[PDB]
Ligand binder design. Structure first.
Ligand SMILES: [Zn+2]
Length: 256
């Protein structure tokens, strides 16, 4: 097998994954497990909108992307993460290059998402496929942007990307490349294409235009989420802080 960080790993995963397809019954079980896993992720997600969007995105990919099904099937049959085991989080971190006057995410205000100097916004999402100490896998990712937002398809594609790390064991390029996507992003882009998610045609995982697109997508998703909860702004930033501190927030979003 190719190394998990080389582009070749993508087509390898799919070739092997296609050998044992998911029956409509297998798919049905996967489907229900994802519904459960996403619902169980409420306590680490910023809002119900984000819960809904994660579920919709993953289920739509299972329903309409052969590539995603092939990747998911690969993991089930080849000792990677079974997609139904993955839970979801919206962890953020302070931007250490920033200017903004805050000790913690809990004290942040919506004004501070606009009024800061340079390109140093106060916080960034943590976007990663990790596991907790009981080896239970999770994806941390940006809060969901608004329905019908410019940011939605890129957000969806990036979410699928992190899931691909778990379900296929793929990695990103070892070096910062402007001409190689890496096998995880290759697969995520194929899923996006099959689903009609409009994303920019980047060639390199770390190319400056991609990095800029991501930061701006994340900042706007955060601004949009904060605005959705303008009525309960302090509760919104406290919840984001609670999640980022790795504690459980209300699974029923009672602060809203
Ligand atoms: Zn990645």
């Amino acid at each position: 097998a190719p190394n998990r960080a080389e582009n070749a790993y993508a087509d390898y995963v799919l070739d092997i994954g296609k050998r044992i397809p998911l029956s409509a019954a297998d798919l049905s079980n996967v489907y229900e497990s994802v519904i459960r896993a996403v619902h169980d992720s409420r306590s680490r997600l910023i809002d119900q909108h984000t819960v809904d969007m994660i579920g919709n995105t993953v289920l739509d990919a299972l329903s309409r992307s052969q590539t995603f099904r092939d990747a998911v099937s690969y993991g089930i049959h080849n000792e990677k993460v079974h997609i139904g085991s993955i839970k979801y989080r919206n962890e953020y971190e302070l931007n250490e290059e920033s200017s903004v006057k805050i000790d913690d995410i809990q004290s942040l205000t919506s004004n501070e998402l606009y009024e800061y100097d340079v390109g140093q916004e106060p916080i960034f999402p943590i976007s990663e496929a990790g596991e907790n100490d009981n080896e239970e896998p999770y994806v941390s990712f940006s809060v969901a942007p608004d329905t019908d937002s410019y940011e939605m398809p890129s957000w969806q594609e990036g979410l699928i990307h992190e899931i691909i790390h778990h379900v296929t064991g793929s990695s990103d390029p070892s070096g910062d490349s402007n001409i190689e996507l890496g096998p995880t992003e290759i697969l995520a882009r194929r899923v996006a294409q099959e689903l009609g998610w409009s994303v920019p045609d980047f060639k390199g995982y770390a190319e400056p235009e991609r990095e800029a697109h991501l930061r701006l997508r994340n900042l706007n998703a955060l601004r949009q989420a904060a605005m959705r909860h303008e009525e309960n702004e302090r509760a919104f930033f406290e919840r984001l802080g609670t999640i980022s501190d790795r504690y459980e927030a209300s699974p029923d979003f009672t602060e809203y």
